[PDB]
Design an enzyme around this catalytic site. Structure first.
Site, PDB file in Angstrom:
ATOM      1  N   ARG A 299       0.850  -1.194   0.000  1.00  0.00           N
ATOM      2  CA  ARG A 299       0.000   0.000   0.000  1.00  0.00           C
ATOM      3  C   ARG A 299       0.878   1.234   0.000  1.00  0.00           C
ATOM      4  O   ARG A 299       1.739   1.394   0.871  1.00  0.00           O
ATOM      5  CB  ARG A 299      -0.908  -0.003   1.237  1.00  0.00           C
ATOM      6  CG  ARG A 299      -1.685   1.276   1.475  1.00  0.00           C
ATOM      7  CD  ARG A 299      -2.578   1.126   2.699  1.00  0.00           C
ATOM      8  NE  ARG A 299      -3.257   2.375   3.039  1.00  0.00           N
ATOM      9  CZ  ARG A 299      -2.904   3.202   4.037  1.00  0.00           C
ATOM     10  NH1 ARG A 299      -1.897   2.906   4.850  1.00  0.00           N
ATOM     11  NH2 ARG A 299      -3.590   4.320   4.237  1.00  0.00           N
TER      12      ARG A 299
ATOM     13  N   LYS B  89     -13.019   2.866   0.450  1.00  0.00           N
ATOM     14  CA  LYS B  89     -12.811   2.926   1.888  1.00  0.00           C
ATOM     15  C   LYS B  89     -14.031   3.538   2.537  1.00  0.00           C
ATOM     16  O   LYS B  89     -14.430   4.652   2.181  1.00  0.00           O
ATOM     17  CB  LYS B  89     -11.587   3.774   2.211  1.00  0.00           C
ATOM     18  CG  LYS B  89     -10.286   3.165   1.747  1.00  0.00           C
ATOM     19  CD  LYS B  89      -9.156   4.191   1.697  1.00  0.00           C
ATOM     20  CE  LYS B  89      -8.664   4.590   3.092  1.00  0.00           C
ATOM     21  NZ  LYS B  89      -7.651   5.692   3.003  1.00  0.00           N
TER      22      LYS B  89
ATOM     23  N   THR C 265      -6.442  -1.052  10.218  1.00  0.00           N
ATOM     24  CA  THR C 265      -6.202  -0.026  11.250  1.00  0.00           C
ATOM     25  C   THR C 265      -5.978  -0.585  12.646  1.00  0.00           C
ATOM     26  O   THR C 265      -6.907  -1.098  13.274  1.00  0.00           O
ATOM     27  CB  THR C 265      -7.294   1.051  11.311  1.00  0.00           C
ATOM     28  OG1 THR C 265      -7.390   1.713  10.038  1.00  0.00           O
ATOM     29  CG2 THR C 265      -6.932   2.090  12.400  1.00  0.00           C
TER      30      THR C 265
ATOM     31  N   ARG D  24     -10.355  20.931   6.368  1.00  0.00           N
ATOM     32  CA  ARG D  24      -9.278  21.434   7.213  1.00  0.00           C
ATOM     33  C   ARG D  24      -9.513  22.885   7.625  1.00  0.00           C
ATOM     34  O   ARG D  24     -10.187  23.648   6.922  1.00  0.00           O
ATOM     35  CB  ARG D  24      -7.920  21.287   6.510  1.00  0.00           C
ATOM     36  CG  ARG D  24      -7.077  20.111   7.000  1.00  0.00           C
ATOM     37  CD  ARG D  24      -6.002  19.718   5.990  1.00  0.00           C
ATOM     38  NE  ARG D  24      -5.420  20.883   5.323  1.00  0.00           N
ATOM     39  CZ  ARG D  24      -5.737  21.279   4.090  1.00  0.00           C
ATOM     40  NH1 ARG D  24      -6.616  20.592   3.373  1.00  0.00           N
ATOM     41  NH2 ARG D  24      -5.172  22.362   3.573  1.00  0.00           N
TER      42      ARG D  24
END
Ligand code: FDP
Ligand code: FDP
Ligand code: FDP
Lengths: 496, 498, 496, 498
Positions: free
Chosen positions: C49, C236, C294, C90
């Site tokens: 990845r 995802k 994760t 952000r």
């Protein structure tokens, strides 16, 4: 799986000691005397069927009186069923004829052709005829030993018909309209008089002929009126409508008869076996008694032994899930009424012993809508706990019979002893698999609020009939000290 | 569950177009003529049964010749079955040719052959030397097809039992004896059976229905009797008494198939216990994948009446639901008034019971009881049937020379026809006892080797199309070997009909 | 039952010899060299990845080149995955602050507050802010180490927020809107350049960040354009929308990542385990690869041994049904990249050996719509016949990989050897449970219409890798001599 | 199927209101104060664990007193568990208090106690006399919690093994030894455990977590150590090595419950094999109906961080899905920064895993493995739970004096609270390790005999109403004896809350 259960079956193992299924016998000349009835009861009869197609009110009164005297002598509660003649379609007056294969004939509904009629233009008392049978379909005559195919409509009331085979005739013969909706009354005028007889004489249940719709079931109930409100109605399914409307007929009735003799005239013979399986299972699923009828041991009308097919048919009705199996001509007018009932009882027990303990229980339980009412949760769990401890008997207090039927619905493998305060409940529970009734006379013996007297009566009955012994666990269902109207309690107790 | 399946059944729905179950008919004076036999075949007969309890070889030769001529005119492959008389126990003769018994009567029965021709009410002969060993005091002797019953009271000497007559009966010369619940040391094959078997082998019959099989050892003695020339003939063992039922596992192992001979069985064991034996025997055959026939009185009343009873209709339906490959007719077609009508009824009831069967329940139940690992051909056959269910295949097609692979597919109970392309006419005829199978003959003499299977597959697909099993663009499941493997099928294909 | 399977489990039995599940590793400074990569491959890595959140096109090119050289040295097909940075929300410029518990702060979307901003009025670059977070809900800052609760809307573009805990800040920090529909582009402008890089360099698959709708999956495909049409898209799932829209995202994607790190910020931490179970099973049911990601062995970033929780988490992802388990920081920048992959591989094998042979097969098969397509009937039946003969291997010819994935969907207990004519299929099948790929070069070796060359190549591979020996049965799936586009044939053959 | 259940799971649905699973917390300097313990109880602690590996009796007395005071102020019944040090194998001392090993290093280990205080890099002591019998050449010795590994190369004499060091490690005085895969003949209870057990019995602790149980015989030796005064204290056996796993059946029979002590177990057996042991041990406890606790590092990272890792969340969820009654916290609450938050997280994850559980699958699976016939009380308890599912009961209510009948109902895994009315405060505390159960104390000294159960039933129904398990007109399933049976419940009733 069924397949794995089958390969484990053995003909060398002991069979069940206590027969679960119930036998209905038709009474007639073979079997009307008090003596004949007693033997019939010793042989295995639980319900006496009076066929009201034939015989007068006086003949059937003798049947009623004689049953009640036979039963009192043997200390049994025998249910009495009135099987109605039912609305029917018949030809008019003639005095005879003959219709060898290939002939062409005309059938009229004009009532001026009722008392007259011949090879060419005879009456049919169903006035909606040229509606039901459209050109190309069939008219069955005399339990459909003779078939007629309609070409077209002559005048408003006549149809033209191609005859299909040999046959003779006489006045007032039976007509069927196979696959046709038939718009007759649920209750004929003869039926009204017969039902009100039945009420007056206190019959336990009505086998209601030719039930086609829920609405007709309600007509039968209203005719029974107030004095007859607690008489079971067992609807006889006899044509394609009955089968089509089965769900709502079941909802309306107390129970069902698969009346195969009549049904096998109305629908193709091979489809009766699909209907049987379907109807019996629908009844099992709602917990209402179902009766399989007609020709089950037919050849024993004349022989001391049944055919291989006949033994099979009885076994498989039991395996299908039927509470009851019935006898008609076999007991009404056969040479071997006792032997045929004894055979039937042995076949029941054998099929019962071949049945997988818990498959019905689970199947039936899995189809129930959740949440259940509390009493049904109590009754199904009581049956589960009977399997879990291998109870040799269950014991239920039931006054209407509701609770007994609710336990029977979950198909335990042991007897269900029902202690009841009503003689008529004892009699009516004769059409429910497994149930054995004991009468508690509350007027004579007192109120029994804490249930101890009826429980003791039931436990003593379990000992006396050799269902169970001291130190055997028994599953006992009734109310606790405060709840009324239904049982909310189960107990496991050891016989003292 | 069964219960959920039942509540959803409908009498109003169309039924299956193609009959899966097969019908064995007994031939007699009702049905022996070429014309009668064509009618019978058109009505649904797949196997013609000859009952060698009766009739000379000449009578049966006529049956054989007639069956063959009828089938030739129709282009059908029809099995011919020879049903043996089998060994017997009988009384001797009586003075005056008869004698009447009433309940309570005491009578001596002896195995001393001195008494063979001079039976009386006091003493008569039974031709079974092991009698006094076989039935102890308390035990029963059944006379004349169980119509009369004797309780054995005591043993008088090593050849004589004192008996008690249970019921009224008139007894004539040489009636049949049954010894309920006793072993019975008759030979597998009587002297008469040998001449009948030899006749059978000579005339090229497809199967024996072997009477009164009690042990696997007797099945092998029947096979040895048929010899090398009869090595390919199916032995269907008739289960007829308690021994047969008790040894069913090893009798199944030794046989090509079973007949549940209910008439005789229900004389040997209580009549009610016949339903238990039926259900067990049928399921045990299903599990190993050998054909089983249900027999006796299935539509008896139609011997005289144009319509069956309600009991008889359910009997046929329930034999099919039990899992029987075949149902049989005896007197109904041998001696009866309505031989076509009764076969037509049987066929309609078969189709109805088939359509009421849950499609996959047998498949799963049968598969779950097989030992793992399977042999590769059985993994191939059961997985082919699985694929057939998954694409709703309208037909399967299998190449089989002995019949083995066709029977192996049928074992898993697909819900569609199994078209078998075979190189042997005898396989065509012998697959008539196997549920679902429909045979096409591939002539390797005419058409050549077919190493790559292509001609036989084309013949099968053409057959499926011509016979209306399936149409262009339907998926068909096709089972045979790849280009190299010999002796069994290792390959499955899904193929759209061209 | 699961319960009955569990009580039979033994820690003393041999485990499976051939690992079915597949391991994805993130590359970074710990693991970028050719040497490190080789060891990582020897250790068990099937897919590399590249995390495109950080690093330049040049850094990732080194990763690509190095993977391809490591793999060529070891003769392996290693898939290469581009994990996109993804659209993100952000804060604007500041240069720092500090927000100890209880403070009251104002967030604006007016872009004139972008380069400015302080403790009192700072920027959020998501211009739909005062739509998504209504008064009372929450704004997560910096992977939600700091939570803010909005009271109301000041001006059109400002919200007023009660701060909930300690925290420091700096420019351009990560924002989450937990439980809020977020209306961003599927593909950022940085993403477009990164994807077109990925196409040009021939990456095998895209791990597409923050996929919320089917429509966004299609945006990702269109961006890959014509030259990238055969690149797998692995979506995802990272927020409540992803979970809500999972059915249609699955339909659109080639596969799914349960991106638990990001998901556990967006939805309550304890709900991630419900989402995981649900998503993995939905993918199993359609036969599309799924990846669990994760913190699976997190503590092995720093320790040579994992925690008990971490071993459990890996085992249970496998038991849940995940094709792949992933490593991020553990391999990208940890002390023990090889050891962590080796642990992960041992845990996979153990969970695989504890799995009931046929439960998945049946469960998955029972949920499929009948009729199946022929190839799916062929592939599911081939797996059934593998169980039936205890095949030690299956063998499938697949050029796109479709057929391999279709066999893997039915969850056999042996390796699936896939002989393919495409190098990229070898690489892409690395995310599919059980599959082991062998390349057949058709340009070099010829057409192989009769399949014999590829079958021989596959059977020889089975021998060489010790899956099977002479006389072992192998289940072999491809087309017969005339059918093209899919396999319609299964064979059982004994290895020569 | 599980698979079908999973695909229908939703993150958007409301979760169960009442937590079924229970949480054991280890007490330490983070959590020992009365105030800290009230917070812990409010956050969801049901049992307070004292780790007698550390701390004097005085430290633990403070824990006991504080737990009792905290629970008194809150009106809670909180179990107190004493976790034994257990016997140990350790090295001796080293010269200079330490020594460093590198891979390839050869070192002799001896069971000769002469060497106990003078360990070097060449030769050191291990206090296990059966050492040279227990590990053969090729076998492994694990040092300092498995951080260092030795391969045994050869046996030098009857008290000395020559070893090969597998990896880098610095070794200090008296490190722990583990002998993976070897039987280990330490006593059930060390000399220290006796003083701790006696202390335990005196202070009235509710359960022992007994360390390092390998055999049923050791469980009985722990029981004998507790004596008559401790006859009522639960023994929860810690499974810690291969022996414990291998003898699990008889250890279960002998114990009141099990703890899967994953930390120690994963030093003895390969770390990956711990998941297999967990699943098996948990299911085997479920099947006999004894409580099982899952332990070790379940939320380890929250010792320092305010949030758990993704692995740790799934670990807790999956222990609950496996079937564990309890989940445990060790350092997370003993020594950690966030003891309330971690218990709150554990409780939320418990509730989520519970709500994701298929309601009846455990019930059925557990019921189908019970031997038939059951004893009547078990038929009563399992059929009560069945009735609860059938009417969607919001609570069950059971009278239990020992806890037996409460544990018997919990065995069948209802999906609702099980309210237990007990006459013993200790039963209240001990039912804290049993899934679903919520205890109410009936004071028979104050309130009288209650022969007819009416007062206890009223207390329970009032409790159900006050605590918001159920409201007026809800069905509640009620289990106790009828008016005459003593010693166990023979009766189930369905009752509408008044
Ligand atoms: O007559 P059904 O409708 O079966 O109801 C009977 C039930 O009701 C109860 C309670 O009302 O009867 P009973 O009052 O006669 O004691 C239960 O004890 C008994 O089981
Ligand atoms: O690439 P996928 O889509 O898996 O299809 C491959 C299948 O198609 C076939 C037939 O077309 O490939 P091939 O032509 O390469 O021989 C089968 O043999 C093979 O199993
Ligand atoms: O303490 P356990 O073993 O649970 O036994 C309690 C059961 O025994 C009985 C009967 O003895 O207790 P109780 O005498 O206190 O009323 C049942 O009522 C009760 O449910």
């Amino acid at each position: 799986s069924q397949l794995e259960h089958n390969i484990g079956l053995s003909i060398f193992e002991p069979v069940a000691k206590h027969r679960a299924n119930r036998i209905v016998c038709t009474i007639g000349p073979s079997t009307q005397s008090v003596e004949a009835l007693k033997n019939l009861m010793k042989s295995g009869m639980s319900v006496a069927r009076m066929n009201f197609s034939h015989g007068s009110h006086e003949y059937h009164q003798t049947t009623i009186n004689n049953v009640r005297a036979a039963a009192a002598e043997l200390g049994l509660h025998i249910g009495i069923a009135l099987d109605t003649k039912g609305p029917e379609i018949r030809t008019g007056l003639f005095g005879e004829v003959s219709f060898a294969p290939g002939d062409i004939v005309c059938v009229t509904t004009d009532p001026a052709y009722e008392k007259v009629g011949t090879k060419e233009k005879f009456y049919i008392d169903y006035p909606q005829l040229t509606n039901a049978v459209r050109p190309g379909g069939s008219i069955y005559v005399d339990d459909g030993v003779m078939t007629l195919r309609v070409v077209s409509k002559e005048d408003d009331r006549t149809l033209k018909c191609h005859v299909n085979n040999h046959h003779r005739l006489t006045d007032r013969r039976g007509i069927n309209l196979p696959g046709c909706e038939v718009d007759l009354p649920a209750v004929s005028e003869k039926d009204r008089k017969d039902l009100e007889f039945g009420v007056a004489q206190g019959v336990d249940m009505i086998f209601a002929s030719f039930i086609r719709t829920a609405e007709q079931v309600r007509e039968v109930r209203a005719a029974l009126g107030e004095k007859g409100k607690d008489i079971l109605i067992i609807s006889k399914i006899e044509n394609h409508q009955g089968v089509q409307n089965i769900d709502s007929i079941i909802e309306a009735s107390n129970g069902i008869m698969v009346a195969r003799g009549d049904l096998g005239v109305e629908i193709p013979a091979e489809k009766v076996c699909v209907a049987q399986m379907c109807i019996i299972s629908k009844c099992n699923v709602v917990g209402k008694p179902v009766i399989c009828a007609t020709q089950m041991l037919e050849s024993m009308t004349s022989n001391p032994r049944p055919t291989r097919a006949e033994v099979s048919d009885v076994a498989n009705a039991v395996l299908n899930g039927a509470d009851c199996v019935m006898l008609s001509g076999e007991t009404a007018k056969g040479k071997y009424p006792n032997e045929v009932v004894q055979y039937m009882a042995r076949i029941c027990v054998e099929a019962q012993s071949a049945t997988h303990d818990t498959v019905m229980f689970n199947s039936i339980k899995n189809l129930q809508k959740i949440p259940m009412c509390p009493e049904e949760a109590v009754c199904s769990s009581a049956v589960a706990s009977a399997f879990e401890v291998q109870a040799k008997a269950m014991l239920v207090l039931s006054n209407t019979g509701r609770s007994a039927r609710l336990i029977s619905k979950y198909r335990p493998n042991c007897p269900i002893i029902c202690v009841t305060t009503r003689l008529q409940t004892c009699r009516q529970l004769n059409v429910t698999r497994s149930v054995v009734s004991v009468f508690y006379d509350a007027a004579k013996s007192g109120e029994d609020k804490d249930k101890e007297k009826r429980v003791k009566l039931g436990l003593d009955f379990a000992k006396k009939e050799k269902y169970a012994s001291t130190g055997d666990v028994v599953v006992v269902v009734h109310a606790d000290h405060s709840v009324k109207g239904y049982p909310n309690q189960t107990r496991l107790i050891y016989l003292p």
